Amino acid sequence: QVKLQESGPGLVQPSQSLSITCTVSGFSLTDYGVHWVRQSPGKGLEWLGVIWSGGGTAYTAAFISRLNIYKDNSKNQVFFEMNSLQANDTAMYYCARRGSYPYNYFDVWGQGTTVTVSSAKTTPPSVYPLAPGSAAQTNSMVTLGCLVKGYFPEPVTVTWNSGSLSSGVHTFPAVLQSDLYTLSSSVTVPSSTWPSETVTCNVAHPASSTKVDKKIVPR
Amino acid sequence: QAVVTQESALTTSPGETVTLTCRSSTGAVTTSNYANWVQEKPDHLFTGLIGGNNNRPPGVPARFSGSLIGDKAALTIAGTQTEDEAIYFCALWYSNHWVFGGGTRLTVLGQPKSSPSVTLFPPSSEELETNKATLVCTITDFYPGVVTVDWKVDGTPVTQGMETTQPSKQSNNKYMASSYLTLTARAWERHSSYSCQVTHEGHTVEKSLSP
Ligand SMILES: O=C(O)CN1CCN(CC(=O)O)CCN(CC(=O)O)[C@@H](Cc2ccc(NC(=O)CSCCO)cc2)CN(CC(=O)O)CC1
Ligand SMILES: [Cl-]
Ligand SMILES: [Y+3]
User: Fold this and answer.
1) Residue A175: phi, psi to the nearest 5?
2) Where in chain A are all domains bearing CATH 2.60.40.10?
């Protein structure tokens, strides 16, 4: 029932600002406090601030002048706004709910917003269909793939047949091939499904405005 | 600003009782610090375990208990389960701000061994039009998360062109990883045998290609 929905991936240039919206459901902001926390690629958790049920706020001392958290109770939205971002502000930012006693625990968290602070060039991914080199045996399982090569920055979303396929799907962690990322995804389906029916890889990279569909064809 | 210290990592076996600690640099951890504990599971998914009054959220196992032991906050897990493999963060309240500890990674041993399922993919015809060829070797369903990948062309080993990921968890608690070998379209057309060898716990599993 309880959800904290965060706004999409954000690429920020040094000295500029960051804005994140946490849209909540299953509870009211009039009863609960919402905290903001971050986790760097090379660290653990760092608490940034909070907006309590009553509208009151608290922040980590070093952030007073650069960070603000406010809300709109009627829209069930909490807004995070931070200025003067630096390279070390690159992290996954989360909003987390916390109630008053006996509900005084950080129970439900948002999925996180990936923030990259960089003066580097945003590169779109080159999506390539991966079909097996050999034809499948009569009445068997086939493993088809999708290569997402050379992108910056993280993340990328990969689905198969618009989300219809999931059980035989594996989406692998990204690797760093010289300032650029590369990942792959596979789907294992019965030989009676493919090439008979259409199997498509759908790839999204928010930061470069790319959304491509690559149909897996034989050879 | 206070620093909150936790053990970096603890390794345990199923059924063991373990105690994670949370220390304050400004002095003793007191009841007024309302110590909270949070659990982080793979794919950056966090969930609350213990509240400020040592209270557990509905659905959190009773084996998780928060307390103060002398001058430090503590999380006692009474009978570690395999599903408790995670990073545990403590958070302390200091009158007008919360401070999270650095986290304690908990590893739980004795989980069943699972051999890797390997798949080798040839480059796309679209790839070859950019005069580049990437061979993808996917590795799934293995436990423990330690694997070595060796690539061979006609039989001769190659160190150049290869890039492999660190093992990470799947939705079923086993590990996955992937390896890439980027060659030119010219090199792909020139040779006849390419191989991906995945070694796990002494045993090697291999998948090959023939143009
Ligand atoms: O919450 C956190 O981050 C950390 N808390 C740690 C302590 N708490 C235990 C815990 O949290 O573990 C016990 C007290 N807390 C109730 C609860 O948690 O049961 C609230 C008591 C309270 C005091 C004053 C007001 N004043 C006003 O409304 C206007 S005052 C205008 C002055 O000119 C409202 C509520 C206050 N905590 C905000 C909130 O809980 O909403 C902030 C502190
Ligand atoms: Cl208080
Ligand atoms: Y409170």
Assistant:
1) -120, 155
2) 2-119, 120-218
- One-letter identity of residue A180: L
Q: To 5 degrees, how large is the angle CA B6–CA B9–CA B13?
A: 125
Evaluate whether the domain defined by A2-119 bears CATH number 2.60.40.10.
yes
Ligand 1 centroid – CA B33 distance (Å): 13
Resolution in A: 2.1
Question: Domains along chain B?
Answer: 1-110 (2.60.40.10), 111-210 (2.60.40.10)
State which CATH number among 2.40.110.10, 1.10.287.3510, 1.10.10.200, 2.60.40.10 fits the domain covering A120-218. 2.60.40.10
State how far the Cα of A8 lies from the Cα of B140, in Å rounded to an integer: 29
DSSP for residue A165: B
Whether A216 contacts A199, CB under 8 Å? yes
Distance from CA of B5 to the nearest CA of A (A): 11
Q: Give me the residue from A44, A96, A175 closest to B180, CB to CB.
A: A175
Phi, psi of B99 (to 5 degrees): -130, 120
Residues 98-117 of B with CB under 8 A from A: 98-103
> Which of A92, A96, A172 is facing B44, going by the closest CB pair?
A92
Q: What is the DSSP string of B40-82?
A: EETTTEEEEEE-TTSPPPTTS-TTEEEEEETTEEEEEEES--G
